[PDB]
Amino acid sequence: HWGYGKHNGPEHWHKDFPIAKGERQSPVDIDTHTAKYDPSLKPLSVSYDQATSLRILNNGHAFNVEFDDSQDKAVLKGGPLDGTYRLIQFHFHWGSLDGQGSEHTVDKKKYAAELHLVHWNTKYGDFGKAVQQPDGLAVLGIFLKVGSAKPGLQKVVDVLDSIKTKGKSADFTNFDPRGLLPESLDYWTYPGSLTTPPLLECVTWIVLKEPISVSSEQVLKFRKLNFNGEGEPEELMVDNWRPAQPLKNRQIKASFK
Ligand SMILES: CC(C)(C)C(=O)Nc1nnc(S(N)(=O)=O)s1
Numbered sequence: 179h180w181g182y183g184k185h186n187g188p189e190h191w192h193k194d195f196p197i198a199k200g201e202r203q204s205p206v207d208i209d210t211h212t213a214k215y216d217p218s219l220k221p222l223s224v225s226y227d228q229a230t231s232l233r234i235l236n237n238g239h240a241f242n243v244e245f246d247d248s249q250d251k252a253v254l255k256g257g258p259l260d261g262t263y264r265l266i267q268f269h270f271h272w273g274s275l276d277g278q279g280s281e282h283t284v285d286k287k288k289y290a291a292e293l294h295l296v297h298w299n300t301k302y303g304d305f306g307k308a309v310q311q312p313d314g315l316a317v318l319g320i321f322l323k324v325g326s327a328k329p330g331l332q333k334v335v336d337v338l339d340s341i342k343t344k345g346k347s348a349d350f351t352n353f354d355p356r357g358l359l360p361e362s363l364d365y366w367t368y369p370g371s372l373t374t375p376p377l378l379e380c381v382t383w384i385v386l387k388e389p390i391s392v393s394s395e396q397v398l399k400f401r402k403l404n405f406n407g408e409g410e411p412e413e414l415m416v417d418n419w420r421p422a423q424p425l426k427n428r429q430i431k432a433s434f435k
């Protein structure tokens with residue numbers, strides 16, 4: 179099964195998921211000087227006030243904080259998007275060292291981690307249908323750098339002990355994802371894919387320019403998670419990031435000059 183090891187990592191995924199070599203794969207390097215400001219891009223509308231988190235799950239590749247997406251409670255709109263995209267889950271990708279971990283890069287710079295807030299286009303009714311559409315998902319990507327703690331992340335950090343191993347979940351209600359956002363909603367956007375198998379080319383990527391800062395202690399706790407299940411040899415959940423993929427016939431657009 180696919181993963182992030184030497185024998186099952188990103189360089190192997192194409193054998194089971196040939197789209198791994200597709201025309202709109204993610205992540206990509208964001209070359210800031212080549213991205214073009216698009217004055218027609220609207221500001222993002224992040225409407226998370228009514229978000230209902232439910233559960234946090236270690237799925238063996240990352241941990242997902244899941245939301246009630248059976249109504250328009252937490253939605254992403256605007257920016258490059260047409261229509262309404264419902265928040266379904268967020269998760270992170272992170273490194274074994276602070277100098278790596280993000281999936282997108284900025285002028286080849288890797289951040290310590292990257293947060294993905296995943297939303298699906300409500301016009302497709304369910305996420306399973308949405309992922310079969312070129313505009314099915316919108317993922318808001320937020321870089322993490324190590325410095326000051328992010329207070330709004332601590333509730334996530336502190337539950338990780340209870341989901342150390344693959345397949346463990348814990349109740350995770352009343353978490354406010356607004357506490358994970360940076361000040362600015364300036365962003366880059368481009369059409370891409372899921373960065374994990376099945377690598378479907380269904381994502382409008384919206385990557386915020388402003389990273390959030392998290393503390394070394396916060397990211398160290400991410401790195402204590404396990405890829406393995408309980409009672410199996412311990413493999414630390416670290417470096418669960420896919421590297422940058424060829425941009426091919428795509429232009430990255432910037433919301434800001
Ligand atoms: C909801 C559903 C489709 C199961 C999902 O979100 N799957 C993801 N698979 N990779 C993602 S990434 N790293 O591109 O945000 S999201």
Ligand SMILES: [Zn+2]
Pocket residue numbers: 269270271294373
């Ligand atoms: Zn992701």
